Tab-separated table of C-alpha atoms in Angstrom:
chain	number	residue	atom	x	y	z
A	1	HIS	CA	20.629	12.400	10.724
A	2	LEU	CA	22.547	9.099	10.354
A	3	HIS	CA	23.753	8.511	6.778
A	4	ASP	CA	25.744	5.390	5.679
A	5	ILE	CA	24.181	2.043	4.814
A	6	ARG	CA	26.255	0.022	7.298
A	7	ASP	CA	25.353	2.285	10.219
A	8	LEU	CA	21.659	2.155	9.316
A	9	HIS	CA	21.819	-1.642	9.079
A	10	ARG	CA	23.294	-2.178	12.552
A	11	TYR	CA	20.923	0.195	14.326
A	12	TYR	CA	17.785	-1.233	12.665
A	13	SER	CA	19.060	-4.744	13.362
A	14	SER	CA	19.768	-4.011	17.032
A	15	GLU	CA	17.798	-5.372	20.001
A	16	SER	CA	14.857	-3.410	21.369
A	17	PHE	CA	13.012	-3.561	24.675
A	18	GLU	CA	9.592	-2.465	25.848
A	19	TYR	CA	8.878	-1.433	29.416
A	20	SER	CA	5.662	-0.857	31.318
A	21	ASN	CA	4.878	0.985	34.544
A	22	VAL	CA	7.679	3.459	33.750
A	23	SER	CA	7.605	6.549	35.936
A	24	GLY	CA	10.329	9.114	36.483
A	25	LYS	CA	10.405	12.721	37.642
A	26	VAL	CA	12.091	14.873	34.963
A	27	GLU	CA	15.539	16.472	34.782
A	28	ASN	CA	17.464	18.845	32.492
A	29	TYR	CA	20.517	17.281	30.797
A	30	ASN	CA	22.355	20.107	28.962
A	31	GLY	CA	19.342	21.530	27.084
A	32	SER	CA	16.742	18.827	26.381
A	33	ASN	CA	14.519	17.200	29.049
A	34	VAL	CA	15.102	13.711	30.431
A	35	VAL	CA	13.689	10.921	32.646
A	36	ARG	CA	15.892	8.374	34.475
A	37	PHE	CA	14.683	4.853	35.470
A	38	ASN	CA	16.362	1.559	36.482
A	39	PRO	CA	14.515	-1.745	35.616
A	40	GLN	CA	20.374	-1.602	34.341
A	41	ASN	CA	20.084	2.218	34.473
A	42	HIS	CA	18.200	4.248	31.809
A	43	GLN	CA	17.700	7.751	30.377
A	44	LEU	CA	14.844	8.990	28.180
A	45	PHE	CA	15.071	12.104	26.027
A	46	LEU	CA	11.747	13.849	25.567
A	47	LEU	CA	12.390	16.233	22.676
A	48	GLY	CA	9.353	15.977	20.417
A	49	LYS	CA	5.609	15.660	20.679
A	50	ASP	CA	6.447	14.009	24.021
A	51	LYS	CA	8.195	17.198	25.195
A	52	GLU	CA	4.640	18.599	25.007
A	53	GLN	CA	2.637	15.711	26.446
A	54	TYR	CA	5.034	14.620	29.224
A	55	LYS	CA	6.256	18.120	30.084
A	56	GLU	CA	6.544	17.324	33.819
A	57	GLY	CA	7.211	13.555	33.806
A	58	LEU	CA	5.985	10.000	33.397
A	59	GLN	CA	3.209	8.595	35.636
A	60	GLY	CA	2.942	4.944	34.422
A	61	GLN	CA	3.737	4.900	30.671
A	62	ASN	CA	5.136	2.294	28.269
A	63	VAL	CA	8.488	3.035	26.632
A	64	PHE	CA	9.810	1.452	23.451
A	65	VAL	CA	13.567	1.701	23.711
A	66	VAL	CA	16.343	1.545	21.136
A	67	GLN	CA	19.874	2.114	22.434
A	68	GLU	CA	21.339	5.304	20.924
A	69	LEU	CA	24.410	5.411	23.206
A	70	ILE	CA	25.800	4.949	26.687
A	71	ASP	CA	26.420	8.501	27.957
A	72	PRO	CA	29.528	9.395	30.042
A	73	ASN	CA	27.903	8.365	33.378
A	74	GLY	CA	26.925	4.944	31.995
A	75	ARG	CA	23.230	5.415	31.145
A	76	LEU	CA	21.339	3.705	28.320
A	77	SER	CA	20.014	6.809	26.535
A	78	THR	CA	16.998	6.487	24.239
A	79	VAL	CA	14.693	8.942	22.486
A	80	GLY	CA	10.902	8.920	22.381
A	81	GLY	CA	8.802	5.779	22.273
A	82	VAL	CA	6.347	6.839	24.960
A	83	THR	CA	2.801	5.406	24.850
A	84	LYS	CA	-0.087	5.759	27.306
A	85	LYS	CA	-0.968	2.715	29.455
A	86	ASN	CA	-3.867	2.194	29.857
A	87	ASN	CA	-2.827	0.921	26.404
A	88	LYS	CA	-4.813	-2.132	25.369
A	89	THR	CA	-3.189	-5.268	24.033
A	90	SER	CA	-5.427	-4.669	21.012
A	91	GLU	CA	-3.937	-6.187	17.852
A	92	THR	CA	-4.212	-5.488	14.139
A	93	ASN	CA	-2.636	-7.100	11.063
A	94	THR	CA	-2.106	-4.425	8.400
A	95	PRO	CA	-1.252	-4.742	4.722
A	96	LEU	CA	2.402	-4.197	3.863
A	97	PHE	CA	3.785	-3.502	0.415
A	98	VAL	CA	7.444	-3.433	-0.541
A	99	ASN	CA	8.107	-1.962	-3.966
A	100	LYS	CA	11.737	-2.346	-5.033
A	101	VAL	CA	12.526	-0.060	-7.961
A	102	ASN	CA	15.885	-0.735	-9.643
A	103	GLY	CA	16.244	1.726	-12.494
A	104	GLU	CA	13.521	0.346	-14.794
A	105	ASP	CA	12.643	-2.951	-13.023
A	106	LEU	CA	10.193	-3.280	-10.157
A	107	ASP	CA	10.044	-6.157	-7.702
A	108	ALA	CA	6.849	-5.674	-5.792
A	109	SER	CA	6.010	-7.849	-2.793
A	110	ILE	CA	3.103	-8.072	-0.388
A	111	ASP	CA	3.291	-8.868	3.313
A	112	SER	CA	1.595	-7.757	6.493
A	113	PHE	CA	2.706	-5.949	9.615
A	114	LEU	CA	1.469	-6.942	13.052
A	115	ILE	CA	0.940	-4.000	15.391
A	116	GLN	CA	0.370	-5.424	18.903
A	117	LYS	CA	-1.150	-2.402	20.762
A	118	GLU	CA	-3.987	0.162	20.595
A	119	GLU	CA	-1.380	2.958	20.572
A	120	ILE	CA	2.098	2.721	19.010
A	121	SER	CA	4.842	5.360	18.865
A	122	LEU	CA	6.181	6.355	15.468
A	123	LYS	CA	9.540	5.311	16.932
A	124	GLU	CA	8.379	1.700	17.400
A	125	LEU	CA	6.453	1.649	14.146
A	126	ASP	CA	9.540	2.889	12.288
A	127	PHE	CA	11.867	0.424	14.034
A	128	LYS	CA	9.755	-2.700	13.639
A	129	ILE	CA	8.972	-1.875	9.980
A	130	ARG	CA	12.627	-1.342	9.044
A	131	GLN	CA	13.773	-4.356	11.045
A	132	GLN	CA	11.331	-6.379	8.902
A	133	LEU	CA	12.686	-4.755	5.739
A	134	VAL	CA	16.267	-5.469	6.821
A	135	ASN	CA	15.523	-9.126	7.640
A	136	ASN	CA	13.295	-9.989	4.634
A	137	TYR	CA	13.851	-7.405	1.853
A	138	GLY	CA	17.606	-6.867	2.067
A	139	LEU	CA	17.229	-3.266	3.233
A	140	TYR	CA	20.531	-1.562	4.024
A	141	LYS	CA	22.447	-4.191	2.042
A	142	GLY	CA	24.076	-3.746	-1.351
A	143	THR	CA	22.029	-1.122	-3.203
A	144	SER	CA	18.883	-1.001	-1.002
A	145	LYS	CA	19.002	2.127	1.188
A	146	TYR	CA	16.996	5.095	-0.182
A	147	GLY	CA	13.213	5.080	-0.463
A	148	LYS	CA	10.197	5.796	1.737
A	149	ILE	CA	7.893	4.128	4.252
A	150	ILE	CA	4.397	5.562	3.697
A	151	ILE	CA	1.627	5.128	6.242
A	152	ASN	CA	-2.053	5.815	5.543
A	153	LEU	CA	-4.053	6.793	8.671
A	154	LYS	CA	-7.890	6.674	8.420
A	155	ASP	CA	-7.737	7.431	4.654
A	156	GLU	CA	-6.919	11.155	5.094
A	157	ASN	CA	-3.505	11.810	6.729
A	158	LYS	CA	-0.109	10.523	5.543
A	159	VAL	CA	3.143	9.712	7.349
A	160	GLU	CA	6.298	9.688	5.196
A	161	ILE	CA	9.617	8.346	6.503
A	162	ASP	CA	12.789	8.730	4.392
A	163	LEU	CA	14.782	5.456	4.566
A	164	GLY	CA	17.996	7.277	3.687
A	165	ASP	CA	18.535	8.298	7.296
A	166	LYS	CA	17.429	7.509	10.825
A	167	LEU	CA	14.003	8.692	11.862
A	168	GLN	CA	14.485	12.243	13.108
A	169	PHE	CA	14.732	12.525	16.873
A	170	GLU	CA	12.000	15.185	16.953
A	171	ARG	CA	9.275	12.880	15.621
A	172	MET	CA	10.107	9.862	17.811
A	173	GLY	CA	7.591	11.139	20.363
A	174	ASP	CA	4.716	10.960	17.826
A	175	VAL	CA	1.960	8.399	18.540
A	176	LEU	CA	-0.500	6.648	16.275
A	177	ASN	CA	-3.746	4.792	16.864
A	178	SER	CA	-3.140	1.317	15.492
A	179	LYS	CA	-6.799	1.029	14.426
A	180	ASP	CA	-6.354	4.039	12.121
A	181	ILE	CA	-3.397	2.529	10.200
A	182	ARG	CA	-4.901	1.213	6.972
A	183	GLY	CA	-1.693	0.098	5.338
A	184	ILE	CA	1.997	0.537	4.730
A	185	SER	CA	3.714	0.932	1.388
A	186	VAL	CA	7.480	1.017	1.302
A	187	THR	CA	9.351	1.867	-1.872
A	188	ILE	CA	13.083	1.226	-1.882
A	189	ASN	CA	14.619	3.196	-4.783
A	190	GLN	CA	17.867	1.351	-5.586
A	191	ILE	CA	21.284	2.859	-6.378
B	1	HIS	CA	1.937	0.474	-26.825
B	2	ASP	CA	1.571	4.266	-26.962
B	3	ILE	CA	0.864	6.426	-23.899
B	4	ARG	CA	-1.884	8.458	-25.638
B	5	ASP	CA	-3.776	5.296	-26.590
B	6	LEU	CA	-3.552	4.002	-23.004
B	7	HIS	CA	-4.646	7.453	-21.913
B	8	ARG	CA	-7.654	7.312	-24.216
B	9	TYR	CA	-8.648	3.739	-23.393
B	10	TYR	CA	-8.398	4.132	-19.624
B	11	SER	CA	-10.040	7.590	-19.929
B	12	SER	CA	-13.056	6.038	-21.663
B	13	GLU	CA	-16.662	5.485	-20.513
B	14	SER	CA	-17.521	2.211	-18.772
B	15	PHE	CA	-20.877	0.485	-18.396
B	16	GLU	CA	-22.039	-2.308	-16.107
B	17	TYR	CA	-25.138	-4.085	-17.326
B	18	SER	CA	-27.468	-6.214	-15.205
B	19	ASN	CA	-29.317	-9.405	-16.061
B	20	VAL	CA	-27.274	-10.189	-19.177
B	21	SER	CA	-28.308	-13.402	-21.002
B	22	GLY	CA	-27.271	-15.184	-24.220
B	23	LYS	CA	-25.924	-18.376	-25.809
B	24	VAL	CA	-22.270	-18.803	-26.825
B	25	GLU	CA	-21.207	-18.837	-30.545
B	26	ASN	CA	-18.927	-18.529	-33.629
B	27	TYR	CA	-17.114	-15.233	-34.236
B	28	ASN	CA	-13.862	-16.052	-36.117
B	29	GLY	CA	-12.116	-18.383	-33.656
B	30	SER	CA	-13.170	-16.989	-30.289
B	31	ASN	CA	-16.359	-17.719	-28.346
B	32	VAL	CA	-18.775	-14.785	-27.975
B	33	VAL	CA	-22.184	-14.067	-26.433
B	34	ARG	CA	-24.362	-11.548	-28.250
B	35	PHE	CA	-26.647	-9.588	-25.945
B	36	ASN	CA	-28.278	-6.147	-26.099
B	37	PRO	CA	-29.996	-3.725	-23.733
B	38	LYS	CA	-32.127	-0.978	-25.359
B	39	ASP	CA	-30.834	0.186	-28.785
B	40	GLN	CA	-27.153	-0.969	-28.865
B	41	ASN	CA	-26.087	-4.521	-29.822
B	42	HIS	CA	-23.170	-5.901	-27.739
B	43	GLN	CA	-20.763	-8.836	-28.313
B	44	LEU	CA	-18.932	-10.353	-25.313
B	45	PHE	CA	-15.705	-12.250	-26.090
B	46	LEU	CA	-15.085	-15.066	-23.609
B	47	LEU	CA	-11.382	-15.737	-24.170
B	48	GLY	CA	-9.885	-16.657	-20.791
B	49	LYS	CA	-10.949	-18.219	-17.477
B	50	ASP	CA	-14.501	-17.306	-18.485
B	51	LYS	CA	-14.103	-19.418	-21.660
B	52	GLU	CA	-14.315	-22.515	-19.432
B	53	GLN	CA	-16.595	-21.242	-16.611
B	54	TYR	CA	-19.244	-19.904	-19.029
B	55	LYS	CA	-19.050	-22.393	-21.947
B	56	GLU	CA	-22.865	-22.752	-22.072
B	57	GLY	CA	-23.422	-18.998	-22.258
B	58	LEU	CA	-24.866	-16.486	-19.832
B	59	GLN	CA	-27.765	-16.880	-17.393
B	60	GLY	CA	-28.412	-13.628	-15.444
B	61	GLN	CA	-24.952	-12.340	-14.520
B	62	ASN	CA	-23.567	-8.801	-14.648
B	63	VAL	CA	-21.060	-7.659	-17.268
B	64	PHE	CA	-18.544	-4.824	-16.921
B	65	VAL	CA	-18.157	-3.307	-20.385
B	66	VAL	CA	-15.402	-1.369	-22.065
B	67	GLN	CA	-15.626	-0.761	-25.802
B	68	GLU	CA	-12.577	-2.269	-27.527
B	69	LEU	CA	-14.030	-1.584	-30.984
B	70	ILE	CA	-17.224	-1.521	-33.008
B	71	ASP	CA	-16.972	-4.674	-35.125
B	72	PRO	CA	-17.777	-4.818	-38.909
B	73	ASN	CA	-21.452	-5.560	-38.197
B	74	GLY	CA	-21.960	-2.631	-35.778
B	75	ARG	CA	-21.742	-4.564	-32.495
B	76	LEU	CA	-19.805	-2.912	-29.654
B	77	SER	CA	-17.209	-5.578	-28.765
B	78	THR	CA	-15.965	-6.199	-25.225
B	79	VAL	CA	-13.759	-8.772	-23.531
B	80	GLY	CA	-14.345	-10.462	-20.176
B	81	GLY	CA	-15.772	-8.618	-17.205
B	82	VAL	CA	-18.405	-11.124	-16.050
B	83	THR	CA	-19.422	-11.133	-12.351
B	84	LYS	CA	-21.868	-13.427	-10.565
B	85	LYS	CA	-25.515	-12.074	-10.439
B	86	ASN	CA	-26.383	-11.186	-6.834
B	87	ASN	CA	-23.754	-9.837	-6.102
B	88	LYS	CA	-25.299	-7.601	-3.465
B	89	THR	CA	-24.282	-4.072	-2.619
B	90	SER	CA	-21.815	-4.841	0.151
B	91	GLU	CA	-19.498	-1.819	0.242
B	92	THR	CA	-15.768	-2.111	0.871
B	93	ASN	CA	-13.365	0.814	1.091
B	94	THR	CA	-9.784	-0.195	0.427
B	95	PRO	CA	-6.590	1.799	0.715
B	96	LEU	CA	-4.650	2.977	-2.285
B	97	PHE	CA	-0.966	3.934	-2.261
B	98	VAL	CA	0.477	5.716	-5.298
B	99	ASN	CA	4.270	5.981	-5.591
B	100	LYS	CA	5.868	8.115	-8.303
B	101	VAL	CA	9.562	7.261	-8.788
B	102	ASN	CA	11.260	10.034	-10.811
B	103	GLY	CA	14.941	9.005	-10.908
B	104	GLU	CA	16.212	9.634	-7.373
B	105	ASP	CA	12.964	11.352	-6.319
B	106	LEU	CA	9.954	9.548	-4.856
B	107	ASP	CA	6.519	11.100	-4.422
B	108	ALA	CA	4.014	8.947	-2.572
B	109	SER	CA	0.340	9.682	-2.061
B	110	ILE	CA	-2.335	7.909	-0.036
B	111	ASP	CA	-5.911	7.472	-1.139
B	112	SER	CA	-8.949	5.240	-0.934
B	113	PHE	CA	-10.689	2.990	-3.423
B	114	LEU	CA	-14.468	2.510	-3.283
B	115	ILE	CA	-15.589	-0.923	-4.522
B	116	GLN	CA	-19.401	-1.192	-4.563
B	117	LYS	CA	-20.263	-4.875	-5.168
B	118	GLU	CA	-19.267	-8.112	-3.351
B	119	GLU	CA	-17.500	-9.615	-6.363
B	120	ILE	CA	-15.505	-7.696	-8.997
B	121	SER	CA	-13.817	-8.758	-12.235
B	122	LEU	CA	-10.119	-8.020	-12.568
B	123	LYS	CA	-11.075	-6.018	-15.686
B	124	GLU	CA	-13.237	-3.632	-13.669
B	125	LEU	CA	-10.769	-3.386	-10.828
B	126	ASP	CA	-8.031	-2.653	-13.353
B	127	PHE	CA	-10.052	-0.031	-15.160
B	128	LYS	CA	-11.268	1.753	-12.073
B	129	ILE	CA	-7.777	2.050	-10.559
B	130	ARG	CA	-6.131	3.268	-13.786
B	131	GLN	CA	-8.956	5.772	-14.384
B	132	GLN	CA	-8.492	7.243	-10.901
B	133	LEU	CA	-4.787	7.505	-11.619
B	134	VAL	CA	-5.402	9.093	-15.037
B	135	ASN	CA	-7.716	11.651	-13.380
B	136	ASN	CA	-5.851	12.448	-10.158
B	137	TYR	CA	-2.199	11.297	-10.497
B	138	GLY	CA	-1.426	12.459	-14.044
B	139	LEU	CA	-1.056	8.893	-15.332
B	140	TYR	CA	-0.548	8.371	-19.082
B	141	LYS	CA	0.491	12.031	-19.288
B	142	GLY	CA	4.081	13.180	-19.818
B	143	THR	CA	6.541	10.687	-18.326
B	144	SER	CA	3.951	8.629	-16.386
B	145	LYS	CA	3.447	5.287	-18.120
B	146	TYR	CA	5.417	2.289	-16.777
B	147	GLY	CA	4.945	0.717	-13.361
B	148	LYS	CA	2.737	-1.846	-11.626
B	149	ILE	CA	-0.552	-2.154	-9.800
B	150	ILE	CA	-0.087	-4.579	-6.922
B	151	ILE	CA	-3.223	-5.832	-5.212
B	152	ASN	CA	-2.915	-7.571	-1.829
B	153	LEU	CA	-5.451	-10.387	-1.400
B	154	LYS	CA	-6.855	-12.117	1.696
B	155	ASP	CA	-3.777	-12.922	3.773
B	156	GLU	CA	-1.938	-13.074	1.421
B	157	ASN	CA	-1.884	-13.566	-2.406
B	158	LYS	CA	-0.523	-11.141	-4.964
B	159	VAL	CA	-1.812	-9.884	-8.314
B	160	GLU	CA	0.499	-7.752	-10.476
B	161	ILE	CA	-0.686	-5.748	-13.487
B	162	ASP	CA	1.757	-3.897	-15.719
B	163	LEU	CA	0.899	-0.242	-16.445
B	164	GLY	CA	3.092	-0.326	-19.545
B	165	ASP	CA	0.360	-2.004	-21.563
B	166	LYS	CA	-3.368	-2.685	-21.536
B	167	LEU	CA	-4.522	-5.546	-19.269
B	168	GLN	CA	-4.035	-8.875	-21.021
B	169	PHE	CA	-7.342	-9.879	-22.637
B	170	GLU	CA	-6.898	-13.400	-21.239
B	171	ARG	CA	-7.060	-12.301	-17.564
B	172	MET	CA	-10.163	-10.098	-17.986
B	173	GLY	CA	-12.304	-13.096	-17.053
B	174	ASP	CA	-10.598	-13.344	-13.613
B	175	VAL	CA	-12.761	-12.277	-10.682
B	176	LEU	CA	-11.874	-11.134	-7.154
B	177	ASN	CA	-13.749	-11.324	-3.857
B	178	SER	CA	-14.147	-7.657	-2.891
B	179	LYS	CA	-13.869	-8.139	0.890
B	180	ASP	CA	-10.543	-10.025	0.424
B	181	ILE	CA	-8.903	-7.002	-1.251
B	182	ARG	CA	-6.597	-5.792	1.531
B	183	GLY	CA	-5.329	-2.852	-0.487
B	184	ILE	CA	-3.747	-1.701	-3.753
B	185	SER	CA	-0.363	-0.069	-4.184
B	186	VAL	CA	0.589	1.315	-7.581
B	187	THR	CA	4.145	2.345	-8.453
B	188	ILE	CA	4.743	4.623	-11.456
B	189	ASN	CA	8.375	4.324	-12.573
B	190	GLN	CA	8.619	7.673	-14.450
B	191	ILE	CA	10.673	7.968	-17.659
């Protein structure tokens, strides 16, 4: 897990790409499973719920990509972010709350969050949400670092994400039906 | 304001009467409208936005009631809470996020809020949320007192209510369009 406010800031401010028609075989890279592709050369770690679902490879999927590192051979490595295609360009605006506790004060704000697909990886959800927090709510700046992103799916399940560190690599493979996302409430608990 | 009084008030029984009618009048300073369904004489203080809107009294509209007191003459007094008339049963479900901030700890739940009618006074919205919280989220019990209810309205206006005290009498006449309620997110800043 990545601690340190400055490190969190840079990563969640970085550039992201989204690719379609991504197919690769499958290959073992010291332990975890991988998929190389070249639209610049690329490497995709399946080590989560995608380890299960893409256990032999990718046929034509979409991949949300955030650059973790360039490995020794020169590959853009990235974890998770795999969605289906056929993956409709469905589109849903969803209520966003940012609740900024600062000891005894509370600066609450309302926004919305535009998911642009029928299916969205928890990786992409997490990235886009925090990038919005970084840009408009001063997340990972001064005293804004700890807190949670909370996602309500069809009024029954919950998805917590601790803002204190990077989304865990294991749950980057998770996928959500956009439709089901009812809202998002973030609560930054200030130092 | 004391936490046990807030507990009592927001733990109390509500009524919503149909077809309420009466002329406006007197009572020391403030406008009121005396009405009465079977066997219990009511007195409705119009001391806010409803002071202007309903300055010639009450045709057939509905009235959300919460007993503030029983006045010297025996009339059960109540402030605000007037909705439109018909006022159909169009049913909206609307997401509810509860966030309990206990120092460095943060416990967030997800839930749903069932609004039954097409319009709804702020008074009724305020009461129904707080009651749910008092019944399911240990509000007004122990260290749970301060915080805010933040309602998100049709893309995208905000309404804050402070949990630290009873809803200001002067806003009880405010009314919301039920469909436009995107979602509520309450934060309890624990002591």
